[PDB]
Short mmCIF file of C-alpha atoms and ligand atoms in Angstrom, two decimals:
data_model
loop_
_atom_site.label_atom_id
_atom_site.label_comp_id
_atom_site.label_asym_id
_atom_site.label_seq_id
_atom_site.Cartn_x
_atom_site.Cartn_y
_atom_site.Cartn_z
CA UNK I 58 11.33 16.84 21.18
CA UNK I 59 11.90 13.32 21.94
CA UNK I 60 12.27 10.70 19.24
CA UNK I 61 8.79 8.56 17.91
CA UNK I 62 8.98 5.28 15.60
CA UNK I 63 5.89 3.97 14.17
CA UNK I 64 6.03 0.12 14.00
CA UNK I 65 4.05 -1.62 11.51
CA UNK I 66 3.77 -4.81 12.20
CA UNK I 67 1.00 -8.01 11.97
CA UNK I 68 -2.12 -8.23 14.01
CA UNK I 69 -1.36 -11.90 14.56
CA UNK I 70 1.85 -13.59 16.62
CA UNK I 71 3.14 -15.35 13.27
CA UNK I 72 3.89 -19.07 13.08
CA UNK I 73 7.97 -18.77 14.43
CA UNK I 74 8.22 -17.45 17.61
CA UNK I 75 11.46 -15.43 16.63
CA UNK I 76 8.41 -12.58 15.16
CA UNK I 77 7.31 -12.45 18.89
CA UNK I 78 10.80 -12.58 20.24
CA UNK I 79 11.72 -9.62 17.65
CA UNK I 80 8.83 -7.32 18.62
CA UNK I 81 9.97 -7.51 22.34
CA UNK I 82 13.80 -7.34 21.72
CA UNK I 83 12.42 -3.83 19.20
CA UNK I 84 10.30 -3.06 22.40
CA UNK I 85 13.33 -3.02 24.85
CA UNK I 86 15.57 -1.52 21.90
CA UNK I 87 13.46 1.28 21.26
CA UNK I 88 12.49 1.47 25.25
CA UNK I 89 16.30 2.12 26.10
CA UNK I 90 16.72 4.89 23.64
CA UNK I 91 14.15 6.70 25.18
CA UNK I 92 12.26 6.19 21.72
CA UNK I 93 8.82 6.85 22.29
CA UNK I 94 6.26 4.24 20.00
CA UNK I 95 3.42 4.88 17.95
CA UNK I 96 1.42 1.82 16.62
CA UNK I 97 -1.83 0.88 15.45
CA UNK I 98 -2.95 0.36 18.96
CA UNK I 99 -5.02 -3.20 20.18
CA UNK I 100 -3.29 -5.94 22.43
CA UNK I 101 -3.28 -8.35 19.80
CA UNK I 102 -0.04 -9.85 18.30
CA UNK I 103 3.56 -8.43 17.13
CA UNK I 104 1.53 -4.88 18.08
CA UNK I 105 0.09 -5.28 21.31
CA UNK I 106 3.91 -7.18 22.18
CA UNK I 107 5.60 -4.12 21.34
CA UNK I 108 3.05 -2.04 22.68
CA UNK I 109 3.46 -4.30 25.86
CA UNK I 110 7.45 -4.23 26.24
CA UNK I 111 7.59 -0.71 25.77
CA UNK I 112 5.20 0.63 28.10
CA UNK I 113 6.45 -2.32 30.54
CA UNK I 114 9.78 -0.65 30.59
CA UNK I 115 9.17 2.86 30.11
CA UNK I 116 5.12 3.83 31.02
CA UNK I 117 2.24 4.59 29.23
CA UNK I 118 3.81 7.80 28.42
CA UNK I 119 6.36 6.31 25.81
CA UNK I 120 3.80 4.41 23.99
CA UNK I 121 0.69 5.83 21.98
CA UNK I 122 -1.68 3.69 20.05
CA UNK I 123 -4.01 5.01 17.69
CA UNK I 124 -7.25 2.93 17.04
CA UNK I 125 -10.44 2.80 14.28
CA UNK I 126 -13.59 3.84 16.39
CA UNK I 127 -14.57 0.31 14.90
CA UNK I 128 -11.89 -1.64 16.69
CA UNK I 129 -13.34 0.30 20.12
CA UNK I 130 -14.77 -2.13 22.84
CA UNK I 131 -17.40 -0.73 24.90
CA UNK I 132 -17.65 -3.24 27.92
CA UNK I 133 -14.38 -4.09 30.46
CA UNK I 134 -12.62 -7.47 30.00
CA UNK I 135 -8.70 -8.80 30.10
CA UNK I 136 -6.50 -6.16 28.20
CA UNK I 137 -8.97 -3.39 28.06
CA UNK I 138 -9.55 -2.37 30.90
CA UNK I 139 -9.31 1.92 30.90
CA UNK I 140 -12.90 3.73 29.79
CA UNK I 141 -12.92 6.66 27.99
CA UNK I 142 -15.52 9.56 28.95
CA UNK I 143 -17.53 8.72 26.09
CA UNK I 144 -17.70 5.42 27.24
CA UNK I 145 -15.23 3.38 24.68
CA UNK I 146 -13.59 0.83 26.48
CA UNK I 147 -9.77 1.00 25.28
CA UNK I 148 -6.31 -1.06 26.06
CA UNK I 149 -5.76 -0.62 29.51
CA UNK I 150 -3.20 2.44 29.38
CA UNK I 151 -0.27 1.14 32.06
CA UNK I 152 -0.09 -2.05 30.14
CA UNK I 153 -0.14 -0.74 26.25
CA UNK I 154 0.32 2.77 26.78
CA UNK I 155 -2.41 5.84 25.75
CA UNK I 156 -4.57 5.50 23.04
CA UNK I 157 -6.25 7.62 20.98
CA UNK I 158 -9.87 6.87 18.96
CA UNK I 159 -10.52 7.72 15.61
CA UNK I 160 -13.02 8.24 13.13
CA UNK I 161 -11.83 6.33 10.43
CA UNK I 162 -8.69 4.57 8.79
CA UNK I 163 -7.78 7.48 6.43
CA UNK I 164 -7.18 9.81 9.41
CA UNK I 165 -6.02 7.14 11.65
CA UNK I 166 -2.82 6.37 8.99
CA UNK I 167 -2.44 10.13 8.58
CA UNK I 168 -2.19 10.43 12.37
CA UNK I 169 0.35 8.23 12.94
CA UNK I 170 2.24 10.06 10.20
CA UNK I 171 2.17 13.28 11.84
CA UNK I 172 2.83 12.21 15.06
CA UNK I 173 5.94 10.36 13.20
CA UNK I 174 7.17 13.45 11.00
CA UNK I 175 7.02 15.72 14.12
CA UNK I 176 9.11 13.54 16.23
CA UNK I 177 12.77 14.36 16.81
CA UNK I 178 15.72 13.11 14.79
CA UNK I 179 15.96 8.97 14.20
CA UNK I 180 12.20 9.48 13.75
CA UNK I 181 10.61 7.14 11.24
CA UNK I 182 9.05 3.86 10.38
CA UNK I 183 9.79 0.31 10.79
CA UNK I 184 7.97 -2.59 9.62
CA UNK I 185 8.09 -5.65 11.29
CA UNK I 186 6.34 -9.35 9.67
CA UNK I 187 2.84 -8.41 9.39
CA UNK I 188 0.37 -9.55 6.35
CA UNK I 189 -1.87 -7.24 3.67
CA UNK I 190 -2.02 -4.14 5.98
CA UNK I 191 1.58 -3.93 7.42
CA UNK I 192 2.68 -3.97 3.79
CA UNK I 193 0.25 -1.89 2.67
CA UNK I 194 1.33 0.87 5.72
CA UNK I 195 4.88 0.07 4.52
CA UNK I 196 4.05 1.28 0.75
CA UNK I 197 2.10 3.82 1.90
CA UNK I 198 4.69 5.64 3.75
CA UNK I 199 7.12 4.73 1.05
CA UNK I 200 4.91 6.51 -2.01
CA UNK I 201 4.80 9.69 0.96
CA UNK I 202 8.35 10.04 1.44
CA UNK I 203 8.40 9.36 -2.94
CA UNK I 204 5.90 12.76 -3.01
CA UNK I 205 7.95 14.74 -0.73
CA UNK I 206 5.88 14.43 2.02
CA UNK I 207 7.98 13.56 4.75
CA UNK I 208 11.57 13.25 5.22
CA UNK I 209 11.65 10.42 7.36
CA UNK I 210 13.16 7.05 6.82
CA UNK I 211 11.51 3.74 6.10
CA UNK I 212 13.33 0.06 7.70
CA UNK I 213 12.31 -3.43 7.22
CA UNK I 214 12.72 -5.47 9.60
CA UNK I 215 13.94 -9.01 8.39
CA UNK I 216 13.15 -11.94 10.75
CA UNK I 217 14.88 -14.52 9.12
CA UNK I 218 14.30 -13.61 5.62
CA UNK I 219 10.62 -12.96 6.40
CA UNK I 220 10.89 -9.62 3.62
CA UNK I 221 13.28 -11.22 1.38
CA UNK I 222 10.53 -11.19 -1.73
CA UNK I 223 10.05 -7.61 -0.86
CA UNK I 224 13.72 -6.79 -0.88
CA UNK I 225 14.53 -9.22 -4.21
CA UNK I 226 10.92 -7.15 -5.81
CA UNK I 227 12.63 -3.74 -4.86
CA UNK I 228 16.17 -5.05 -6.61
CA UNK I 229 13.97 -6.18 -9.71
CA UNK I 230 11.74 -2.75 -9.82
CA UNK I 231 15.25 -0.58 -9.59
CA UNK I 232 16.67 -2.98 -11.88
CA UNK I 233 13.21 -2.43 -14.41
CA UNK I 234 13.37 0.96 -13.85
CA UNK I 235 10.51 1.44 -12.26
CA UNK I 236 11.68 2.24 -9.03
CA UNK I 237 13.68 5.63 -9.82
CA UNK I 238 16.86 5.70 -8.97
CA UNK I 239 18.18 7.24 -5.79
CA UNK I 240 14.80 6.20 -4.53
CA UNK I 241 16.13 2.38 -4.43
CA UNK I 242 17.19 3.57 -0.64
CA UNK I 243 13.79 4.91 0.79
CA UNK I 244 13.71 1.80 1.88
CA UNK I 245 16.64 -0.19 3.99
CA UNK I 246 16.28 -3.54 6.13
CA UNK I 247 17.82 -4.64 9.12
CA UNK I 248 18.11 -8.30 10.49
CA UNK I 249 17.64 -6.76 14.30
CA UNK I 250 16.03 -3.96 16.46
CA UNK I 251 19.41 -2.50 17.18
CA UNK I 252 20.22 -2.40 13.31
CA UNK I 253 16.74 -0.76 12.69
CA UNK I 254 16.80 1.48 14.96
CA UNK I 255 20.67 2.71 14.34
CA UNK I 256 19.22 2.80 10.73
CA UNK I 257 15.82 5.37 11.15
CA UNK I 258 18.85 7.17 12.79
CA UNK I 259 21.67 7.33 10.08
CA UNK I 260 19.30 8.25 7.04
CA UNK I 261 18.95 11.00 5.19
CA UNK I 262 16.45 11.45 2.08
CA UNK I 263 18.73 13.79 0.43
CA UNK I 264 21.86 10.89 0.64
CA UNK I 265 21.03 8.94 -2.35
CA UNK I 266 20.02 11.94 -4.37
CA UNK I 267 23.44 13.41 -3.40
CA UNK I 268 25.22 10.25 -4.44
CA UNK I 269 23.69 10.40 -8.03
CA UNK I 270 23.98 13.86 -8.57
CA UNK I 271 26.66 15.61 -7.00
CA UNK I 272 29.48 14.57 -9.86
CA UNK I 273 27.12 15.70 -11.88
CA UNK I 274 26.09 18.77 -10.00
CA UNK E 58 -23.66 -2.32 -17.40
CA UNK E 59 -20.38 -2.89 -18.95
CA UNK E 60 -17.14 -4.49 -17.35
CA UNK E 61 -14.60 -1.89 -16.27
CA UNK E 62 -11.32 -3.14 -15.41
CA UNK E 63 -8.56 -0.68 -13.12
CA UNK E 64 -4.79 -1.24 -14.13
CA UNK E 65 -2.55 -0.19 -11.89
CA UNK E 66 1.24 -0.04 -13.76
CA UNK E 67 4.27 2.31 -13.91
CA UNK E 68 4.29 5.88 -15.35
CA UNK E 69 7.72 4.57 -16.56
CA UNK E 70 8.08 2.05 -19.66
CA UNK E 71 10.46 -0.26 -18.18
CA UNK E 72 13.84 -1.50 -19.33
CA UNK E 73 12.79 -4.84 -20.95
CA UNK E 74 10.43 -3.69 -23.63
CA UNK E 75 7.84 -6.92 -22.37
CA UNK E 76 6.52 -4.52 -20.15
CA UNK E 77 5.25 -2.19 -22.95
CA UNK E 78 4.48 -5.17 -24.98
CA UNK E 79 2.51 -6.59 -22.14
CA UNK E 80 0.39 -3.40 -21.77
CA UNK E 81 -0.34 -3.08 -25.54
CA UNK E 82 -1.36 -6.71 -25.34
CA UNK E 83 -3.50 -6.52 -22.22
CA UNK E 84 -4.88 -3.14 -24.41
CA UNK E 85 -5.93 -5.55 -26.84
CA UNK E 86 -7.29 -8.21 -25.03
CA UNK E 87 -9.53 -5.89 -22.45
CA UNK E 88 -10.72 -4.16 -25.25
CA UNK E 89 -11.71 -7.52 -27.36
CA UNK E 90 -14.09 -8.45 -24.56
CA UNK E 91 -15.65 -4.98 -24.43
CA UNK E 92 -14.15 -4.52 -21.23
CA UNK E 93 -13.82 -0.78 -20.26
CA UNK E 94 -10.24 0.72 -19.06
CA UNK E 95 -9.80 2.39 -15.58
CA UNK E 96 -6.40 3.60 -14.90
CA UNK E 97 -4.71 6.95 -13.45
CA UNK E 98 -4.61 8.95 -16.03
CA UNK E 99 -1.41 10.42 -18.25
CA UNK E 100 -0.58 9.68 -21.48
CA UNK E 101 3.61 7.96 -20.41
CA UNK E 102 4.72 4.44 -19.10
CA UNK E 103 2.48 1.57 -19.41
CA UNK E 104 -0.63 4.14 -17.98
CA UNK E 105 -0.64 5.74 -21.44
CA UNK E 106 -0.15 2.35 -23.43
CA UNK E 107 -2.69 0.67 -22.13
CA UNK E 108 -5.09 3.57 -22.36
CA UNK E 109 -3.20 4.55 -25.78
CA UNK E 110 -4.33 0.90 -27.15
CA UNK E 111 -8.00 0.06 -25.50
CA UNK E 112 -8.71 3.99 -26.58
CA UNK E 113 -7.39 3.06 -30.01
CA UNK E 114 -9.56 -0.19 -30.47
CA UNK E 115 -12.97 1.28 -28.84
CA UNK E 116 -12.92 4.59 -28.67
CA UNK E 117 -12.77 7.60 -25.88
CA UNK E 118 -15.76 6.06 -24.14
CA UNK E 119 -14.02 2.65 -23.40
CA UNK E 120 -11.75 4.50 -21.49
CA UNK E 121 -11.78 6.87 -18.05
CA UNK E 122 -8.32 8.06 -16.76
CA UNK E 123 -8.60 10.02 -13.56
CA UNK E 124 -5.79 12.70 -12.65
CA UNK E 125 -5.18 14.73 -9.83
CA UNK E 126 -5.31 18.50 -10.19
CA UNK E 127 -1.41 18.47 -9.44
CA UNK E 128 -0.44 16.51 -12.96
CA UNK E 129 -2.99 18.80 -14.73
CA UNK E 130 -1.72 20.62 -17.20
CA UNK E 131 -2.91 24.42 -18.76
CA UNK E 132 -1.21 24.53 -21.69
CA UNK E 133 -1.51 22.51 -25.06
CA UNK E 134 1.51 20.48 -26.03
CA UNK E 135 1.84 17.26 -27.47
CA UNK E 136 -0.43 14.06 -26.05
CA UNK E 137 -2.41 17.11 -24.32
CA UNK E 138 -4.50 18.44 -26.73
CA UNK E 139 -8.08 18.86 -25.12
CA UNK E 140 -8.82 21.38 -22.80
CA UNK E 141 -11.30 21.22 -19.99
CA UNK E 142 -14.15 24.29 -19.76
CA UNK E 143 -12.06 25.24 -16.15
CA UNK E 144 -9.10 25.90 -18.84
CA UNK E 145 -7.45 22.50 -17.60
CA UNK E 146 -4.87 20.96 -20.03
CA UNK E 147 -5.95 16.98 -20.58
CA UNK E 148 -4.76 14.33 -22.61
CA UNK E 149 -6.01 14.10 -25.73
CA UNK E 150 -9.72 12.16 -25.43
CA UNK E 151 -9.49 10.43 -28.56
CA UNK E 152 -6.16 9.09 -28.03
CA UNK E 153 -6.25 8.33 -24.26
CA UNK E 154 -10.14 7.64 -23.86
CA UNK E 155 -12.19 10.55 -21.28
CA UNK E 156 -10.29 12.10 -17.96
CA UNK E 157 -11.81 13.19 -14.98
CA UNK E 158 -9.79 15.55 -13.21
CA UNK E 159 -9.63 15.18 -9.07
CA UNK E 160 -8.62 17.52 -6.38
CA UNK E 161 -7.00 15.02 -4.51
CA UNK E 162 -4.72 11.23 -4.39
CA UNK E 163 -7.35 9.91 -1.87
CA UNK E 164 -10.58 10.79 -3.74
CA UNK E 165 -8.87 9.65 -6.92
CA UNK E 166 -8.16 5.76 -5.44
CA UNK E 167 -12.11 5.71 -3.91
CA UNK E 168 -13.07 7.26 -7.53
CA UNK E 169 -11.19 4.38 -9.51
CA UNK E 170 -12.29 1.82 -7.10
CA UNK E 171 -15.59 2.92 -7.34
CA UNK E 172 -15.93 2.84 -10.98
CA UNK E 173 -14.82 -1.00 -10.58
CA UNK E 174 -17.11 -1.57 -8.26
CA UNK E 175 -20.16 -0.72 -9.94
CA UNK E 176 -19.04 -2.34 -12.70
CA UNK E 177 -20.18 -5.27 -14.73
CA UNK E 178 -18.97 -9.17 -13.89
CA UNK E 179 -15.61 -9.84 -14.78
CA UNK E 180 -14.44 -6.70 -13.34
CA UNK E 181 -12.02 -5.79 -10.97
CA UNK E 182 -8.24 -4.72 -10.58
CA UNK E 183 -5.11 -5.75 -12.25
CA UNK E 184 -1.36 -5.28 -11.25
CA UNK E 185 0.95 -4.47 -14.05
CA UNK E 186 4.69 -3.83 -14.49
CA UNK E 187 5.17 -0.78 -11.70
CA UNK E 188 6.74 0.81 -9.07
CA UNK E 189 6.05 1.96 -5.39
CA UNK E 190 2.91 3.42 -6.68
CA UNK E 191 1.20 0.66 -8.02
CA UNK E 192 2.34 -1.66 -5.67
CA UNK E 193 0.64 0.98 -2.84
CA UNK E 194 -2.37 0.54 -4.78
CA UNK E 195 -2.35 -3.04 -5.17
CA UNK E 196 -1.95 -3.83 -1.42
CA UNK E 197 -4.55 -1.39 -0.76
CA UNK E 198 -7.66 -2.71 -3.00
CA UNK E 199 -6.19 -5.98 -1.17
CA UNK E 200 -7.00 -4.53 2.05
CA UNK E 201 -10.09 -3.14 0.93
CA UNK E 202 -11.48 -6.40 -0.25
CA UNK E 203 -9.81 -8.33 2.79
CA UNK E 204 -12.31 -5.82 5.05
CA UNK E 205 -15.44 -6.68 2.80
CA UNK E 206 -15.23 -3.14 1.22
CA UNK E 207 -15.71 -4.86 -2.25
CA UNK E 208 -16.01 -8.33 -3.89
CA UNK E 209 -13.52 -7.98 -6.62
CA UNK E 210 -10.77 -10.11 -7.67
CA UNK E 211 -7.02 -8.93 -7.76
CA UNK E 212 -4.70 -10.17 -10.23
CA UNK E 213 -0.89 -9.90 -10.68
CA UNK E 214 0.50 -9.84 -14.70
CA UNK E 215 3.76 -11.05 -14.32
CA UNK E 216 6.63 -10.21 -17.14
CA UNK E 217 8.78 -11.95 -17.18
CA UNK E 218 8.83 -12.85 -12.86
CA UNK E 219 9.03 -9.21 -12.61
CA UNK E 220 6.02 -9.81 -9.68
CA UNK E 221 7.88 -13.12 -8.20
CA UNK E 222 9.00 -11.23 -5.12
CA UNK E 223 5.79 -10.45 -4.03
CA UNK E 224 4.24 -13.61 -4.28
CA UNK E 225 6.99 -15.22 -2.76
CA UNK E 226 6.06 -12.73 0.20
CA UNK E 227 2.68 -13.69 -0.20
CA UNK E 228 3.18 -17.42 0.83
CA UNK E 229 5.74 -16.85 3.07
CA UNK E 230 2.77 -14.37 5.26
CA UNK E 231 0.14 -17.27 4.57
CA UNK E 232 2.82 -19.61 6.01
CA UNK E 233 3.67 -17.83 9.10
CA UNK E 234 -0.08 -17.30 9.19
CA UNK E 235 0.48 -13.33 8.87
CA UNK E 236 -2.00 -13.56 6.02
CA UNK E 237 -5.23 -15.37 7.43
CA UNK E 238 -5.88 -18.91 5.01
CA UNK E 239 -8.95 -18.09 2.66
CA UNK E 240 -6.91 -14.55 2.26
CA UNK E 241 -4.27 -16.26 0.11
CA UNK E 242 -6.54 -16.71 -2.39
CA UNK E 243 -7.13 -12.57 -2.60
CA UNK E 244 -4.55 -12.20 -5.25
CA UNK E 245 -3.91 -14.23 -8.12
CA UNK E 246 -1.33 -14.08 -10.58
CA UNK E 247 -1.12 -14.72 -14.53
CA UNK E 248 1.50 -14.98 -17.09
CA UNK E 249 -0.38 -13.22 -20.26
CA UNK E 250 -3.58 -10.70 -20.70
CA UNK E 251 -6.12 -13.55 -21.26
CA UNK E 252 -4.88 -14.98 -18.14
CA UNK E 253 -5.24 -11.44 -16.11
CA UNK E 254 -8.84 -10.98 -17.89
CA UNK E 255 -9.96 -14.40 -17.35
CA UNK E 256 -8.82 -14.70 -13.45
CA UNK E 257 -10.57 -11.30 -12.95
CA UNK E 258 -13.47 -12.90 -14.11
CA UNK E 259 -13.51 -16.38 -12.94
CA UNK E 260 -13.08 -15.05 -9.10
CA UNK E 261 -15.26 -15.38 -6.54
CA UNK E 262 -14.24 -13.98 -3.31
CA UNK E 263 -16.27 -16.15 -1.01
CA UNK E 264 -14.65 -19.33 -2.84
CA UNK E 265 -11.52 -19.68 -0.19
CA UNK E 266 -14.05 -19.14 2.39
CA UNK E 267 -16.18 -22.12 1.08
CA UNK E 268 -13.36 -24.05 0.24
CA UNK E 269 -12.11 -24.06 4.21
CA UNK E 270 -15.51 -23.98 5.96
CA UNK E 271 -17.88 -25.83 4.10
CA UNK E 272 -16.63 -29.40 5.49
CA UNK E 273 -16.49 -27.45 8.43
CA UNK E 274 -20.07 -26.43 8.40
O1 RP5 V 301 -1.31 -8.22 9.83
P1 RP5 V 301 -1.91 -7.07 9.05
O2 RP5 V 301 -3.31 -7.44 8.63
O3 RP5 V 301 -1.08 -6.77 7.83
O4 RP5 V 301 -1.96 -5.77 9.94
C1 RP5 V 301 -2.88 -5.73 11.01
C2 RP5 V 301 -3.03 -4.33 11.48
O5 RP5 V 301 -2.26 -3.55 10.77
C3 RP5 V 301 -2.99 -2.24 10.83
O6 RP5 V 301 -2.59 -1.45 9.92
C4 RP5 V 301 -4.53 -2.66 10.59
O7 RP5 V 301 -5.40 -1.45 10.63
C5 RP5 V 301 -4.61 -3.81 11.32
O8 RP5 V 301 -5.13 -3.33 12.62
O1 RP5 V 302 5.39 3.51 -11.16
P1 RP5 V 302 4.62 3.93 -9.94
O2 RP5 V 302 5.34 5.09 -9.29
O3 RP5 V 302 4.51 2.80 -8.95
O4 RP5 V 302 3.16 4.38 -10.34
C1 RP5 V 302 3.01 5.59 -11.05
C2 RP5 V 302 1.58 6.00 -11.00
O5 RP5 V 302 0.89 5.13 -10.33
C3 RP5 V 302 -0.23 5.97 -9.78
O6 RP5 V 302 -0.81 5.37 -8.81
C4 RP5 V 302 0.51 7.31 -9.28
O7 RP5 V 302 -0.49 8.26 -8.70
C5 RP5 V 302 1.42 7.50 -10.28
O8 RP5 V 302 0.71 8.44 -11.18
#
C-alpha cells in the first residue's frame, strides 16, 4: 500500500510567490517519495500547483482530487478538459491527476479522510497557506485524530511565518489548558516540504501520550 | 421569535480563572437582553457556566444544550439529575436549561446552527475561551457563512489575548489575499460580553460587500 498525503491548502496563489514556489517544491517532494496526493481537486491556486507538479512528475495515477458536484463544469475549456460519462466536465486527468465527484462537502471531507487513513505508513495531512477552509480542514482533522478517529499525523506548513498565530494560539491553548496535554503535538510545523514530509513520517499518536505517562505508568 | 445566541467554549475551565469569569459574565449579559443560550451541552468548563448562569437568570427555557448520544449518560449522579423517557441520563433542566439528545457530531453542529439561524436579530455565534473543538466550530460557521449558508455574524471574546493568535492569522490570510477582502470582516472580535452581544447584533454580512463595491457599482 503506497503512501497518500492530503494537502490542504488555499484556493488562491497568495500574495508572495514563495506559497506558489512551496506547493511545487511539496509537489516534487512528495512526487520523489513515491507519495501519492489527495487534494480538494480544481486547477486553481496552491491546489491545482500541487496537483500540477505531482502528476507532471509522476502521472495521473499519483494524484487524486476529490471535487463538490457543485464545483463540476459541464462544457470543455483550458484545464478541464476530460468528460465524465455522466457528462461532468472535470480537470483534465494527465495534467491534475483523477478526480472523483461528489455529492456534497460532508462526504467529500470524509473521503479524503479515508483515502488518507488507509494509506501506508508517513500517511497524513499537511496544510499549506490557505484561508477559512484550509484551516477549517486543518481543525477538522485535528478534533478526528482528538476522538480517536484516525491515527495519522497532522503538519503545518510554515511559509515564512504564514501559521505563526496558529502555532503562538496552540502554545496559549496548551498553556490555558484547553488544549490537553499530550495533545499539544497532534499538530507539528515544518518550514519546508522535505521537513513535512520527514514529519507525517516520524509521528506517532501514542508518542506524546507515552512521554506523559510512562513514569507514571 | 426570540434571539438565540450559540457559544462555542472549552469543556475545560481554563487556568486563568477570566475564562470562567468571562462565561459567567457573558451568562449574565445574554440573559439581560432576553437572549436565549445555544451551546453543546454538559454541565463542565465554560459549556456548563454559561448554561449554569443564563439557566440560573431565565430559566430552563432560555436555554437548549444539545449532546450526542456518546456523552449521554444512564445513570443519576450529580449535575445529571433528569432522565429522558428513552432512560437517558441528562443534565439537570433546571440548572443547565433543556437538552436535546443527538445521534450524531454532524447533526448536532447543523442542529445548533440551525437553532441560530431561525433565530431572532441579534443572533448568531460566539467564540469563547476553548480548545481544538471550538476552534473547529468556529472556522466552520465561518465557512458556512463565507458560502452564503447563513447571514450571521461571528464574534471572538478574547480573555485576556487568549484569541490574538488567530486574528493575527486572520490578517496575515487577508494580506496574502488567502482570505478574499469583504471576508475579513466575517469575524469580529471583542474584549467583554456587551461587546460579543452587541457585535453579534450590530453585523450585517453584506456590509464588507457594500463597503468594497458600492463605489464600484
Ligand atoms: O483558501 P480556502 O478558502 O481556505 O480553501 C479553498 C478550498 O479549500 C477546500 O477545502 C474548499 O472546499 C475550497 O475548495
Ligand atoms: O475545548 P474543546 O475541546 O475545543 O471543545 C469542547 C467541546 O466543544 C464541543 O464542540 C465538543 O463536541 C466538545 O464537547
Amino acid at each position: 500500500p503506497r503512501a497518500k498525503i492530503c494537502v490542504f491548502c488555499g484556493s488562491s496563489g497568495g500574495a508572495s510567490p514563495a506559497h506558489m514556489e512551496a506547493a511545487r517544491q511539496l509537489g516534487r517532494v512528495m512526487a520523489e517519495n513515491n507519495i501519492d496526493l489527495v487534494y480538494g481537486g480544481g486547477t486553481v491556486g496552491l491546489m491545482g500547483e500541487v496537483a500540477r507538479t505531482v502528476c507532471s512528475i509522476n502521472g495521473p495515477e499519483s494524484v487524486h482530487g476529490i471535487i463538490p458536484e457543485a464545483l463540476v463544469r459541464y462544457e470543455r475549456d483550458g484545464t478541464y478538459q476530460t468528460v465524465k460519462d455522466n457528462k461532468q466536465v472535470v480537470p483534465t486527468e494527465t495534467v491534475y491527476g483523477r478526480t472523483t465527484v461528489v455529492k456534497d462537502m460532508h462526504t467529500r471531507k470524509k473521503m479524503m479522510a479515508e483515502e488518507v487513513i488507509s494509506g501506508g505508513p508517513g500517511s497524513g495531512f499537511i496544510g499549506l497557506s490557505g484561508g477559512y477552509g484550509t484551516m477549517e480542514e486543518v481543525f477538522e482533522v485535528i478534533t478526528w485524530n482528538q476522538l480517536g478517529i484516525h491515527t495519522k499525523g497532522i503538519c503545518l506548513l510554515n511559509v515564512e511565518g504564514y501559521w505563526d498565530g496558529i502555532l503562538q494560539w496552540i502554545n496559549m491553548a496548551a498553556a490555558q489548558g484547553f488544549v490537553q496535554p499530550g495533545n499539544e503535538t497532534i499538530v507539528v510545523s515544518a518550514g519546508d516540504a522535505e521537513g513535512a514530509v520527514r514529519a507525517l513520517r516520524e509521528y506517532k499518536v501514542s508518542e506524546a501520550t507515552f512521554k506523559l505517562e510512562w513514569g507514571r505508568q
